[PDB]
């Protein structure tokens, strides 16, 4: 009663059933994982710029 | 026949009854329709030569649906007061005295209907 | 045969309020007529919010109403909301507010009337501004619900701040393994 | 070059060719339908054409035919305004439908013989 039976038969069809979802367009706006020193300097710069 | 007050012909898509499969083979299976659910049921799978299954496509025309072969629509009346609802559209509705109305009251109902010019489907019934 | 997909042929929608309230149904009738005839997206919005479920109409705060009215140019416009207008104890000064709403709580109504304001119904709003002229459309915060706190990525996945479903709160209720580095890991 | 590769890709399933004046006019007059708010509306009057393509100066079936035939600046709008033609089976039948036209079959580019085929199909 062998029961390993791996396959990839219908998986592409299942994936395309609902369409392949491309990544959003705001992912490039976040500064997550950016250099800590650069982020610190950016925070200081943003804190001080005079609005008018 | 043409629908009373109109000129549309009454058309019946089907006339035979949708009998339950195997109701002819077995007595315990009543002829009232049941949708087959069996995995291998050939009627369910729609093999050629098998009885058709009820479907909305068989639905009768909206204009002629519920119309009797004489061209009217049945309305059930239980007493003399019930004859009023038939009074206005007497050209498209036909009265039918309820089965439970006794011969004592059927007489008055029939006389009043004849006076009002309302047709009855079972006027000459239950005469004692 | 024609090669098309029927999965999304039907779109779920509310063509009338699920509520059996006769007055709500009458308001829906009136604003369906108004939207169909005047052809105004304002009336369409009012109709949709009338037919919405109560979950989508979160209560609105008198503080928010006052903030909306105090903005430059809004002093004389009528605030329209299908959300219940509640009273805010944290609000000390209430300006003059003209509001059309389904329901206004006792305290909010008293404060609005005392401040020289006016409260009308949606049919009175229809008579006043049939096309929604001089209006300020407002609603309560929809995502501010304890139920919404539990929605999102599962609590046990990285960078997730979803609230778990816990019997109680304390050191003995889901605070040991997978929540601190001293026990296996922390997410 | 942006459409020929599509035709090569769909070669086995289509028969296509170069329509002529009579073919275009017959298609537009006998089987002309417009996509008006997502509805297939028969083109029984020039006003139907003018309502949708009046912005581009196409006001009659003759203007539409000229646009299609000469591939004018508004070919995209002119053609997309037309519902895909729903043709009848040819009177006389097909030949193979499983082999290219040059193999004595039906699919592929039959060049100007598409007019001969459409004289039966339409």
């Amino acid at each position: 009663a062998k029961s390993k039976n791996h396959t990839n038969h219908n998986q592409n069809k299942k994936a395309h059933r609902n369409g392949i979802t491309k990544p959003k367009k705001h992912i490039f706006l976040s500064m997550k994982g950016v250099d800590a020193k650069f982020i610190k300097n950016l925070r200081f710069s943003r804190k001080n710029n005079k609005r008018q | 026949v043409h629908v009373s007050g109109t000129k549309v012909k009454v058309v019946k898509k089907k006339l035979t009854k949708f009998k339950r499969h195997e109701s002819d083979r077995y007595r315990r299976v009543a002829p009232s329709w049941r949708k087959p659910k069996g995995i291998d049921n050939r009627v369910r799978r729609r093999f050629r030569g098998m009885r058709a299954m009820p479907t909305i496509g068989h639905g009768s025309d909206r204009r002629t649906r519920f119309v009797l072969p004489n061209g009217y629509k049945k309305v059930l009346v239980q007493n003399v007061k019930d004859l009023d609802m038939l009074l206005m559209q007497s050209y498209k509705y036909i009265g039918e005295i309820g089965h439970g109305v006794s011969a004592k009251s059927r007489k008055g109902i029939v006389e009043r209907a004849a006076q009002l010019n309302i047709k009855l489907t079972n006027g000459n019934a239950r005469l004692r | 045969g024609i090669d098309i997909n029927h999965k999304h042929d039907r779109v779920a929608r509310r063509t009338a309020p699920k509520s059996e309230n006769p007055y709500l149904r009458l308001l829906s009738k009136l604003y369906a007529f108004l939207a169909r005839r005047t052809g105004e997206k304002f009336n369409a919005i009012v109709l949709k919010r009338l037919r919405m479920s109560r979950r989508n109409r979160q209560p609105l705060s008198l503080a928010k109403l006052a903030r909306a009215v105090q903005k430059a140019g809004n002093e004389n416009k009528t605030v329209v909301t299908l959300s219940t207008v509640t009273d805010d104890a944290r609000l000390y000064t209430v300006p003059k507010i003209s509001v059309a709403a389904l329901h206004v709580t006792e305290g909010a109504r008293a404060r609005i009337l005392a401040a020289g304001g006016e409260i009308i119904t949606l049919d009175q709003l229809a008579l006043k501004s049939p096309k929604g002229e001089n209006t300020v459309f407002l609603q309560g915060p929809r995502s501010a619900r304890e139920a919404e706190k539990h929605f999102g990525p599962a609590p046990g996945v990285p960078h997730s701040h979803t609230k778990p479903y816990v019997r109680s709160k304390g050191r003995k209720f889901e605070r040991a393994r997978g929540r601190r580095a001293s026990r296996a890991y922390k997410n | 070059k942006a459409t020929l590769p599509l035709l090569r890709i769909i070669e086995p399933y289509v028969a296509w060719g170069y329509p002529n004046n009579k073919t275009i006019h017959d298609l537009l007059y006998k089987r002309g339908y417009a996509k008006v708010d997502g509805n297939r509306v028969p083109i029984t009057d020039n006003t139907i054409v003018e309502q949708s393509l009046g912005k581009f100066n196409i006001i009659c079936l003759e203007d539409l035919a000229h646009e299609i035939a000469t591939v004018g600046p508004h070919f995209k709008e002119a053609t997309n305004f037309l519902w895909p033609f729903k043709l009848n089976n040819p009177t006389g039948g097909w030949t193979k439908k499983t082999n290219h036209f040059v193999e004595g079959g039906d699919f592929g580019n039959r060049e100007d013989q598409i007019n001969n085929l459409l004289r039966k199909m339409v």
């Binding site: - | - | - | 193999e103 060049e111 013989q113």
Partner: protein, 179 residues
């Protein structure tokens, strides 16, 4: 595959050439005689043979002209010689065949039918190297030669005649001999 469909294949002259490029501003012009059912097939076979012979394919070339050729005088009988190359199930062979006809296209159609009949060879496995008109004394096939006789005579021995628009049954006697 390619099939010689249609009675009496048509004959076309096809002239084409490689599309000029910067390194080769002027290209040679090639011309072929092709027997095919219609001009689309004519162009296809033209490109087939030209791609076989010269480094050029349909993508990089163009068809200067495609024209049909009609028999000059279909009121006279000629002997046609056909040099062809064809592939059997085992190998490739060159054949020279002879036919008698009033049209070269008719002779080529006869050649296709004869090859199909005698060698079970289909049109896709046959290349027609050459077709010419041979004189009476330059023929070398007995079947064609036996008809180069001014005194030729022969009867029609056993003529079975088919009734066309009558009942299947009759009382008439059937006669196959007509002296």
């Amino acid at each position: 595959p390619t099939k010689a469909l249609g009675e009496t294949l048509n004959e076309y002259v096809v002239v084409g050439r490689k599309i000029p490029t910067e390194k080769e501003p002027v290209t040679p012009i090639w011309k072929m005689q092709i027997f095919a059912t219609n001009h689309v097939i004519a162009k296809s076979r033209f490109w087939y043979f030209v791609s076989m012979l010269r480094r050029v394919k349909k993508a990089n070339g163009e068809i200067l002209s495609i024209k049909q050729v009609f028999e000059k005088n279909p009121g006279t009988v000629k002997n046609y010689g056909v040099w062809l190359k064809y592939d059997s199930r085992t190998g490739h062979h060159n054949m020279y065949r002879e036919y008698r006809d009033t049209t070269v296209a008719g002779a080529v159609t006869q050649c296709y039918r004869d090859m199909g009949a005698r060698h079970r060879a289909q049109a896709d496995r046959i290349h027609i190297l050459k077709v010419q008109t041979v004189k009476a004394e330059d023929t070398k096939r007995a079947g064609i030669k036996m008809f180069h006789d001014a005194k030729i005579r022969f009867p029609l021995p056993h003529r079975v005649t088919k009734r066309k628009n009558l009942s299947v049954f009759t009382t008439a006697r059937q006669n196959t001999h007509f002296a």
